[PDB]
């Protein structure tokens, strides 16, 4: 959905 490293942005 959002631009993660794939998944979600909490690595972002």
């Given amino acids: ?3 993660p490293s794939g998944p ?3 690595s972002n």
């Fill in 1 to 3: 959905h959002e631009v």
């Fill in 8 to 10: 979600n942005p909490s």
